Amino acid sequence: LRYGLLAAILGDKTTKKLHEYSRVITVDGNICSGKNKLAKEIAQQLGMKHYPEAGIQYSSTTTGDGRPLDIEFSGSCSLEKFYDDPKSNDGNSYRLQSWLYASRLLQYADALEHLLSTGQGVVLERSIYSDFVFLEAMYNQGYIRKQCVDHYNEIKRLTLPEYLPPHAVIYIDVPVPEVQSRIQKKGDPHEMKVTSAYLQDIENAYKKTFLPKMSEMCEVLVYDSWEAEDPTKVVEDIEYLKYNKGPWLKQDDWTFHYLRMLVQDKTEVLNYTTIPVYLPEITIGAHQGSRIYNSFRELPGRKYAPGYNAEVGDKWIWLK
């Protein structure tokens, strides 16, 4: 029985599953700040589920066979192209950022669905709550238009308030001169082209907007690099957080039911990311739009709903 009101009435209830570590934890920081290694160890030590940072292909890898798709099927945006030419007049900068917000939104709904249905906590690497620090950095560097900013803030206004924020927000503070050194050691040809002014904007957005905003409703834990390098120290701080603020305190069985009804329905989750606002950067004409859509339905496993694709081994179709 698919989850719904009947399943909820028959015992399937969220509050019975929540325990000490049924938490949403996000790890933030500038580029190359060590979020991934820390997020992996926080989740491992606490018995939580680690979600790697949602990328361009996040939706591709959580649907179908989980294999990456051709880029025209996956936002038609490129991070490498963004670093090579952040002011390309084909709209790549904002098309990328808009796609990454929607992929983060999908991941946040997937993580919340996991927590609400199982009671296991989740550990995220950035989130829809911290996605704007990249948008602000692009705008401050003149990489995107103001109308792109207004479009982004509208979609965020329509989607983010529907969800519960994380229980704890973990911030790793690495200064920009150190971030640049780590990017150069990292050795990615295009990422090495990122300006320090762009990295400073990210840090400015993080420290003036995101952290003060998040401290009103979440536990905030800030670390320098030397503290974060020992992930067991961070875990120890998490074990003794109190969680005496925010919206999670006033949730009951039926507010959790209706949030669960939202986050299991992915097209409902993504609804307002597709509002018909005709920003050129993210508007596709029908000729390109329909060519792309027709080819996508010719990929293996994609012509029909899952379980009805005989060419990938689906069986008993005539009785399904």
Partner: protein
């Protein structure tokens, strides 16, 4: 069809939720004392009250 009367109409919000200007905090301000049985005759306790 545009009209002079409806020139100022905007489309409704995408989720039916309007961003309205912040509503007015309107707490009652009351002088509790000094001339009050509970004020010990000399305490001017200014109270902000909601109900």
């Amino acid at each position: 069809y545009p009209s002079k009367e409806t020139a100022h109409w905007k489309p409704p919000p995408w989720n039916d939720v309007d961003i309205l200007k912040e509503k007015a905090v309107t707490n009652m301000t009351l002088n509790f004392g000094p001339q009050h049985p509970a004020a010990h005759g000399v305490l001017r306790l200014v109270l902000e009250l909601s109900g």
